[PDB]
C-alpha cells in the first residue's frame, strides 16, 4: 500500500519500437516543473534500419508570455538495458527552443489505440520522483474507448499520479 518508487513503477515488458512507431496524439499529461508543451500536442515515433528510435512532436507552448509558439520538437532515444526504458535527447528544429535530455519510459500501451509514458526528471531522497511528467497518447485524436481509459486509469495510480492530469485540447491551433 506504500509505494511511489520510480524503480518500483512497473513498465511494459517487451517494448517494440516497431509496432509502436507511427503517429500518436496526446490526450492527457502531467505537468512537470518548469515550462512545458501546453496545448495541441502530437508526437510521431519512428525507428530506422539500425534499430535506433527517434521522434518529433508538434505542440504549443506559452514561452515567455503572450508568446505562443507552436513548437516543432525532435528527440533521439538512446536504447537502455530495457526495451521499454529510454533516455531522450532532444531539441527543437528552431534554435531558441528549449533543448534537453530527459528519461523516457513507455509505461504501457496496447500499441494500436492507447499509450502511457512517464518520465522522472529528478529523484527523491528515498526514491520518489519529484520532477515528473507524463502523457497518454492515443492513435485516434478523436478520443479513446473507455476500456482504454479504464486501463489508463490503472497505470496512473500505478505512477502515483492519479487525478494529477490536466486534459489536452485539440483546436488545431497549428
Amino acid at each position: 500500500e506504500r509505494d511511489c518508487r520510480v524503480s518500483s513503477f512497473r513498465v511494459k515488458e517487451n517494448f517494440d519500437k516497431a509496432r509502436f512507431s507511427g503517429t500518436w496524439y496526446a490526450m492527457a499529461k502531467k505537468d512537470p516543473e518548469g515550462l512545458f508543451l501546453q496545448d495541441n500536442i502530437v508526437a510521431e515515433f519512428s525507428v530506422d534500419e539500425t534499430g535506433q528510435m527517434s521522434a518529433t512532436a508538434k505542440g504549443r507552448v506559452r514561452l515567455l508570455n503572450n508568446w505562443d509558439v507552436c513548437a516543432d520538437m525532435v528527440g533521439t532515444f538512446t536504447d537502455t538495458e530495457d526495451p521499454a526504458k529510454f533516455k531522450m535527447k532532444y531539441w527543437g528544429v528552431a534554435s531558441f527552443l528549449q533543448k534537453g535530455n530527459d528519461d523516457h519510459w513507455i509505461v504501457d500501451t496496447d500499441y494500436d489505440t492507447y499509450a502511457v509514458q512517464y518520465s522522472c526528471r529528478l529523484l527523491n531522497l528515498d526514491g520518489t520522483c519529484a520532477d515528473s511528467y507524463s502523457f497518454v497518447f492515443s492513435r485516434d485524436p478523436n478520443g479513446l474507448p473507455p476500456e482504454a481509459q479504464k486501463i489508463v486509469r490503472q497505470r496512473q495510480e500505478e505512477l502515483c499520479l492519479a487525478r494529477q492530469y490536466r486534459l489536452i485540447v485539440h483546436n488545431g491551433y497549428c
Partner: antibody
Amino acid sequence: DVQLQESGTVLARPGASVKMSCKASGYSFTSYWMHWIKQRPGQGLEWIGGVYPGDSHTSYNQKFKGKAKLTAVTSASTAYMELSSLTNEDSAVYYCTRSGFDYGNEDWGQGTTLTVSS
Amino acid sequence: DIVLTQSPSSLAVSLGQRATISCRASESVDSYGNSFMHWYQQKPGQPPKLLIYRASNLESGIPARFSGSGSRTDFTLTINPVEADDVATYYCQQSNEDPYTFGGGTKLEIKR
C-alpha cells in the same frame, strides 16, 4: 463549443417524483462525467453525484443516495437525475456540470429551477 | 466528509486593491504531492464559474487578477487588482476525498 443545455423549470407535488435532463454537445459525452449540484437560497452548493456515460458507472453522496437516481443515454448524449418522494426541502435549483475522467470542476449548465409546492 | 469554512462571509474592498478570500479544511486536501482545492465565481442570477483548478493552476479564460495558494488545510484566493465587474460570491471546493464538498462561499463587495 462545449454546449450543455438543461430542461425547463419543474413543479411537483409533495411526495411525487421528477426527472431532469442535460444534453451534452461539443465534447465526447463518454470521455467525461457530468455531476449534479444542488444550491438552496441562503445555503450554497452541495454536490450530488456523477455519471460515467461510457461505463454507465455512478458516484453518489450518501446524503442523496436515496433521493436522486442518475442515468444517461450515450446515443442521446444526455445524463439524467430523478428526484423521488419529494419534500419542501429538495425544492431548490439543480445544476448539471460535466467533469473530467480524472479531476473535478469545469462546465456548468444554465440550471433548472425546481419548486415543490401544492 | 471534510469541512470547508469561508473565513469572512462578507468582503468589501476598494476598486484597485487586493482581496484575500480564505478556505480552511477539516482534513488535509493535499495528497500524493499536490493539492485538490478549487475556486469558483458565482455572479447574480447565474451558475458558478470555474476560476482556479488545484489551488494554484489558473483556468484559461480567467485573468491574472486571480491566483491561489495553500497546502495541508490552508488556502487563499487572491483577487487583485479587484475589478468593478468582479462583484460576486466565491466558493472553494475540494476533491481529495469523497464526498466532494464546497465552502460557504463569500460575497465580495466593492467600496465606492
